[model samples]
Target: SMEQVAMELRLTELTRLLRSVLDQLQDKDPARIFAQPVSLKEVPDYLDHIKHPMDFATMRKRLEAQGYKNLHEFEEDFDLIIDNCMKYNARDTVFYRAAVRLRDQGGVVLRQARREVDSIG
Candidate 1:
């Protein structure tokens, strides 16, 4: 019992670090729609365009459940949010513009997370 609890406790830092990155990502969403999961009911053709949808809330679900095996895996899910937005929307739409910004900024966030993990550990 003690060992199991100890193992879980050690992962708390990883959880917080990743969740903080998710928070910053949430701040960049102009539509505020990325703050949670996306539903086809609103976008109608959403499912027809994007096969894989991701959101901050879904990422949170993975984090809480330890679904992410490593930082790179986590980053993929993060970028999926951007990629989905960029793909499913018109080139000039607000969603695409936001995804463009997030793509560049998300790179920064990933690198910073790399460094932050070292500092935090």
Candidate 2:
């Protein structure tokens, strides 16, 4: 079920991305094919201002602080973040692309982690 959800989300994201790219090329499509107004709240706030550089090491440390010993165990949390980005960060195509990539990688990592747990069981 989660896989299905992920696939659907990914496809939806890809469609939006394609539409966006075409819109840029068409200069907003004079035919008004993609003229619907996007509500402000639906867009990510990250685009309006600068974002701090990636601090992966510090983020990992924060995970450790939360008692998460294994990076692999962070898949659900990572996936949730990706899902949120896919839903809310539609305006930032770069981050949206990164989120999709991370989401895919998280699936790979999660499968490996699950194998370890299954072996233990």
Best by lDDT: 1
Clashes found in each candidate (C-alpha, N, C closer than 3 A): 0, 0
Q: Which stretches of candidate 1 lie over 4 Å from their true place?
A: 1-7, 118-121
lDDT of 1: 0.80
For residues 36-92, write the lDDT of model 1, one tens digit per residue: 777767778877788888988889899988776567888888888888887788898
TM-score of each: 0.81, 0.41
The 0-to-1 C-alpha lDDT of every candidate, in the order given, reads 0.80, 0.44
Candidate 2: lDDT of 90? Answer: 73
Tens digit per residue, CA lDDT, model 2, 1-121? 9998876665554444333322232342233222232334764564453222222233344443443333344444344445655655575576567666655644554565557545643
Q: Model 2, poorest ten-residue lDDT window? A: 49-58
Overall local distance difference test of candidate 2 = 0.44
Q: Model 1 residue 43 lDDT?
A: 79
